[PDB]
Short mmCIF file of C-alpha atoms in Angstrom, two decimals:
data_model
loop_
_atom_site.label_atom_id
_atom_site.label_comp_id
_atom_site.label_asym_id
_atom_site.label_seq_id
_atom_site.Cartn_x
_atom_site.Cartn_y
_atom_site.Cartn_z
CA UNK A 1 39.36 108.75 166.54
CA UNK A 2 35.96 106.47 166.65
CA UNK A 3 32.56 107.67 164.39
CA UNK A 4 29.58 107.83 167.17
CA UNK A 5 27.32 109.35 164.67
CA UNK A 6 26.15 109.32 161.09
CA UNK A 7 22.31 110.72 160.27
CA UNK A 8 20.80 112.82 157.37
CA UNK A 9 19.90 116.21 158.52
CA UNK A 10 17.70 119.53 158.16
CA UNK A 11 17.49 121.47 160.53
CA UNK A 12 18.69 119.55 163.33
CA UNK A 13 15.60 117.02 162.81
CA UNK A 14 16.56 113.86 161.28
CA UNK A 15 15.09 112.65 157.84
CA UNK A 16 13.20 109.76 157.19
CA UNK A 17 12.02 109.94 154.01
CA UNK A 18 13.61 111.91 151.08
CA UNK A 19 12.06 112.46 147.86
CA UNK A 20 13.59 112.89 143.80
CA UNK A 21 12.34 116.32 144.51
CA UNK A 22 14.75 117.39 147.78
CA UNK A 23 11.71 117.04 149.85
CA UNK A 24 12.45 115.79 153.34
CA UNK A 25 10.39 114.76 156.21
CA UNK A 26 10.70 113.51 160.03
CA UNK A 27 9.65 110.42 162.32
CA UNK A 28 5.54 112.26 162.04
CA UNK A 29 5.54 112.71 158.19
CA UNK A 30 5.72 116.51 159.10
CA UNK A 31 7.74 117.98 156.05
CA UNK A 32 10.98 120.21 157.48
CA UNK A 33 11.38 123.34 155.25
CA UNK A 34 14.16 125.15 157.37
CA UNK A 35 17.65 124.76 157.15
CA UNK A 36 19.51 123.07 154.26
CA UNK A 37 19.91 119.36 153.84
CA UNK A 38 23.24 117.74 154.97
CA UNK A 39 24.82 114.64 156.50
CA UNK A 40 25.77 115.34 160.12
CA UNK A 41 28.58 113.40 162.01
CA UNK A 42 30.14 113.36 165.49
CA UNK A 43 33.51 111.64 166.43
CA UNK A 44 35.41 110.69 169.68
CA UNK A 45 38.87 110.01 170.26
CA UNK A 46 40.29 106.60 171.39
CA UNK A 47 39.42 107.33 174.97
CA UNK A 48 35.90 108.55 174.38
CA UNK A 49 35.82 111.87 174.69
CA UNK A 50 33.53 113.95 171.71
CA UNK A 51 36.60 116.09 169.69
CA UNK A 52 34.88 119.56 169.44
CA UNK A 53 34.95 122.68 167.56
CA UNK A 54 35.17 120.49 164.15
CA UNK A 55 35.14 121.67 160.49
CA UNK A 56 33.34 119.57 158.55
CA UNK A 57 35.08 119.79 155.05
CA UNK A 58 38.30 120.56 156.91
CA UNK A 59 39.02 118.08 159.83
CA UNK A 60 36.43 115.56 158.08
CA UNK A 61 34.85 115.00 154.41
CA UNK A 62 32.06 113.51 152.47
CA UNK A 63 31.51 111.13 149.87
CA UNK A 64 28.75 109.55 147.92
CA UNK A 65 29.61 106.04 146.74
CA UNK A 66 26.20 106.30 144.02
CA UNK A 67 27.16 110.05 142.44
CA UNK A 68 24.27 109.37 139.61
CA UNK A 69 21.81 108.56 142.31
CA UNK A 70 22.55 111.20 144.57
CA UNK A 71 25.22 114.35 145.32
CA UNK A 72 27.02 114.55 148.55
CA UNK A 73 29.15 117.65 148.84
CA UNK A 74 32.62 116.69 150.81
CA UNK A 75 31.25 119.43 153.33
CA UNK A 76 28.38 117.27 154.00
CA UNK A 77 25.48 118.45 151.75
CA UNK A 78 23.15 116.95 149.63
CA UNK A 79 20.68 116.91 146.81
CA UNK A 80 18.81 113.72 145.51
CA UNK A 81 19.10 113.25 142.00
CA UNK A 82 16.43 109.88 140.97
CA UNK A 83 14.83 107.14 142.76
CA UNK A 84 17.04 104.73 144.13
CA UNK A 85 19.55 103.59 147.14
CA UNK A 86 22.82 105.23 147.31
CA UNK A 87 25.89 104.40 150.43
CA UNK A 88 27.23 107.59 151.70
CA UNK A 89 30.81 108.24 153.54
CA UNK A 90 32.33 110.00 156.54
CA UNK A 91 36.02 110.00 156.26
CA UNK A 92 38.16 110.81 159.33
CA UNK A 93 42.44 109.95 158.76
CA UNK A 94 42.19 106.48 158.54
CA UNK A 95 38.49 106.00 160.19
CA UNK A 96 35.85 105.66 157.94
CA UNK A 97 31.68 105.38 158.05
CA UNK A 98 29.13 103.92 155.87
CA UNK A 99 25.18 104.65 156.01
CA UNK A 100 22.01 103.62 153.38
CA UNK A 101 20.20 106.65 151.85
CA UNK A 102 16.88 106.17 150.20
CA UNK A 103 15.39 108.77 147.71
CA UNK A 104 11.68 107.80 146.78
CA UNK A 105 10.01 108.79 143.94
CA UNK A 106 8.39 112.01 143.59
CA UNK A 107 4.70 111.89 144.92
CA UNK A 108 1.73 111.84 141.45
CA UNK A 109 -1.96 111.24 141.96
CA UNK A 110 -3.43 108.02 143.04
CA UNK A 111 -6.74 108.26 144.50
CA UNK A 112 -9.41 110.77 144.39
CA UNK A 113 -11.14 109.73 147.45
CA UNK A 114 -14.52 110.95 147.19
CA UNK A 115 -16.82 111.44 150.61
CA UNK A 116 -20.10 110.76 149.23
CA UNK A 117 -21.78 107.42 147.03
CA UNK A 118 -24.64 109.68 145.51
CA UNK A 119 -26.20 112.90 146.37
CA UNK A 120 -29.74 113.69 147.23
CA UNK A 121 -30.58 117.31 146.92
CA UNK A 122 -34.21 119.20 146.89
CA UNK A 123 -35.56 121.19 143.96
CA UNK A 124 -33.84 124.92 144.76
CA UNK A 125 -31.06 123.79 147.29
CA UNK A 126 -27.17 123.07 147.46
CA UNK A 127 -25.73 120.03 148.88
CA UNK A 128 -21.87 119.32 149.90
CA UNK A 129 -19.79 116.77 150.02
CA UNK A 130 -15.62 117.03 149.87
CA UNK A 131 -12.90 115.34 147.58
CA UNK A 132 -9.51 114.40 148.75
CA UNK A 133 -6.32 113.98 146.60
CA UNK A 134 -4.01 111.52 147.37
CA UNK A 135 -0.42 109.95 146.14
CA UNK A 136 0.72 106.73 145.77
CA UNK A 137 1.98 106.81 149.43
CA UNK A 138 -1.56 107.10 150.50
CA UNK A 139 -1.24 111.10 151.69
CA UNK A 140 -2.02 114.07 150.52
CA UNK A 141 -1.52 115.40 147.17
CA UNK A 142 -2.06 119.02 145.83
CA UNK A 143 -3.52 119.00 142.56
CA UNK A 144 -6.47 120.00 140.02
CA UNK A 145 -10.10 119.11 139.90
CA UNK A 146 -12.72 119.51 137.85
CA UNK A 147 -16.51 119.15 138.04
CA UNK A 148 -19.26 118.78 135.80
CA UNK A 149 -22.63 117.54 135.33
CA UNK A 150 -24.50 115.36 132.35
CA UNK A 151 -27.31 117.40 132.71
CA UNK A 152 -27.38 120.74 133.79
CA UNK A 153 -30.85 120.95 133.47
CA UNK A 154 -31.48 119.00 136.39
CA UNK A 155 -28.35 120.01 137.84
CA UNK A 156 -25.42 121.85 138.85
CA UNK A 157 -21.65 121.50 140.18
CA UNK A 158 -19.12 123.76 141.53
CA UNK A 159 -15.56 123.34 143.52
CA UNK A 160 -14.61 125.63 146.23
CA UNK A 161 -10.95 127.25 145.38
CA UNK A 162 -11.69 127.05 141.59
CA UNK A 163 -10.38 123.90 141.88
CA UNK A 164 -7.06 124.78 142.00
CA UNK A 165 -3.79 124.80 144.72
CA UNK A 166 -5.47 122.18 147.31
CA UNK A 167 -5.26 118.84 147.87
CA UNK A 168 -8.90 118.87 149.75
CA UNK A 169 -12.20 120.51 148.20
CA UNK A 170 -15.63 121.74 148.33
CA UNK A 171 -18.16 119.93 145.90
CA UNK A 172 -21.62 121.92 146.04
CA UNK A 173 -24.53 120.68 143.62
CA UNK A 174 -27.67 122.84 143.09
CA UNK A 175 -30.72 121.23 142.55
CA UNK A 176 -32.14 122.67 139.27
CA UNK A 177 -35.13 120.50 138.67
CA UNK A 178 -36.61 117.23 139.33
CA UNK A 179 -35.05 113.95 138.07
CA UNK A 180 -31.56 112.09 138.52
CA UNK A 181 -28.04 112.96 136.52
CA UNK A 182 -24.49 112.47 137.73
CA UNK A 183 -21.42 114.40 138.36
CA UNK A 184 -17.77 113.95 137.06
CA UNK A 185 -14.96 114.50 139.01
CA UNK A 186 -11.85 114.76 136.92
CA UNK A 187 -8.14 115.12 138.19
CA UNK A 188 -5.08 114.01 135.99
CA UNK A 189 -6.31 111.51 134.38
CA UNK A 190 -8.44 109.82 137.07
CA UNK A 191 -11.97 110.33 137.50
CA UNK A 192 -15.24 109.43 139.69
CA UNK A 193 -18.55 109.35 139.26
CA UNK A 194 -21.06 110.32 141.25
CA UNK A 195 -24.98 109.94 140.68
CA UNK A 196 -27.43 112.63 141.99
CA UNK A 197 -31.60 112.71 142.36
CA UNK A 198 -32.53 116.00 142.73
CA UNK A 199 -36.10 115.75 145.05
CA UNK A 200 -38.91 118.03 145.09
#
């Protein structure tokens, strides 16, 4: 025979980026959640002509050359195990295939990117402004927040979602009475400060 093709799979879509967690996405950063993840292969014979109605396990099997670093069932599945590179296998008779495989660390909390620089509200009214997780990739991160004000007095804080669940939230502060204060916004163990004059 002759391997034509070696990719990681889920789905049919192929995976660019795999994390610790068996997390998987495609060429967009669009995470695939159907099907289970595997190793596909195709083969032709020594004329060129794709051999079909294959069993993978059967006619051809699997093997991971970095077993600590991640599990490659002879059938063709897998499940990442740590951070790391691991060289998988397609075995064929005699005919043989080698491809990379990256698994990337698990996303944690990087930034809390924070729309605003200081808040002005009036004496009696709400003002908005939104806070945005993100991981050490730069993207998205679901995760907890938490609000609060030095003096509540002159001012108060709230989170839409009760600050739970979402990786994007509401911050509303009321304007209690006249004066500057400023609000904490605490995730992890990151936090930003913002200041706030509350205006007549």
């Amino acid at each position: 025979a002759e391997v034509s093709e070696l990719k990681l799979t889920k789905d049919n879509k192929e995976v660019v980026t795999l994390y610790a967690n068996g997390n998987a996405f495609d060429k967009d950063g669009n995470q695939i959640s159907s099907g289970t993840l595997t190793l596909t292969a195709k083969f032709k014979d020594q004329y060129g002509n794709e051999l079909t109605g294959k069993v993978a396990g059967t006619d051809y099997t699997f093997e991971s050359l970095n077993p600590e670093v991640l599990v490659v069932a002879p059938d063709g599945s897998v499940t990442p195990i740590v951070p790391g590179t691991a060289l998988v296998k397609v075995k064929y008779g005699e005919v043989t295939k080698t491809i990379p495989v990256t698994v990337k660390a698990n996303p944690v909390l990087e930034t809390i990117a924070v729309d605003s620089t200081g808040v002005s509200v009036a004496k009696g009214q709400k003002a908005t402004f939104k806070v945005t997780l993100k991981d050490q990739y730069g993207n998205k991160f679901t995760g907890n927040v938490n609000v609060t004000s030095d003096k509540t007095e002159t001012a108060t804080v709230s989170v839409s979602n009760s600050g739970i669940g979402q990786s994007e939230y509401t911050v509303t502060v009321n304007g209690v009475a006249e004066g500057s204060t400023t609000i904490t916004i605490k995730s992890g163990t990151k936090e930003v400060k913002v200041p706030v004059n509350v205006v007549a």
